[PDB]
Amino acid sequence: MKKRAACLCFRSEREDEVLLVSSSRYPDRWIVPGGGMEPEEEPGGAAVREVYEEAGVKGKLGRLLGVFEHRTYVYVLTVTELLEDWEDSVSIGRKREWFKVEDAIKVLQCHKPVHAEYLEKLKAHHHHHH
């Protein structure tokens, strides 16, 4: 399996607002930040690196939301700092933006239904306080 990490970055512990970034292939579309993992890389470390590179995010890594299946480990993270200029903003003009979870689901549904699925699972888990 080709392994990937993805990360739901929240503005606070409320987990009501999530940071999406623009797609590198489709620059006007939104996606959940993440990427491919190196050999034997811990998915958690990869998530932290990816949000730093793609979204200019520093924060506190939280729980593994789940493993989705090429095979993606999806973590949550509480943002503590947003850098003004970051690697992908400089290199490819990648954008980032805060969305309410439901809005996020809406913009992801059409072309990134799998990413929307991450937030649907988040919602289901919220309902049961875990």
From Swiss-Prot:
Cellular component GO terms, alphabetical: cytoplasm; cytosol; nucleus
Tissue: Mainly expressed in testis and, at lower level in brain. According to PubMed:12121577, it is widely expressed.
Cofactor(s) the protein needs: Mg(2+); Mn(2+)
Location of the motif Nudix box: 35-56
Binding-site residues for Mg(2+) 2, renumbered to this chain: E50
Summary of pH dependence: Optimum pH is 8.5.
Family: Belongs to the Nudix hydrolase family. DIPP subfamily.
Function: Cleaves a beta-phosphate from the diphosphate groups in PP-InsP5 (diphosphoinositol pentakisphosphate), suggesting that it may play a role in signal transduction. Also able to catalyze the hydrolysis of dinucleoside oligophosphates, with Ap6A and Ap5A being the preferred substrates. The major reaction products are ADP and p4a from Ap6A and ADP and ATP from Ap5A. Also able to hydrolyze 5-phosphoribose 1-diphosphate.
Name this polypeptide is given: Diphosphoinositol polyphosphate phosphohydrolase 3-alpha
Name of the encoding gene: NUDT10
Residues of the full protein shown: 17 to 144 of 164
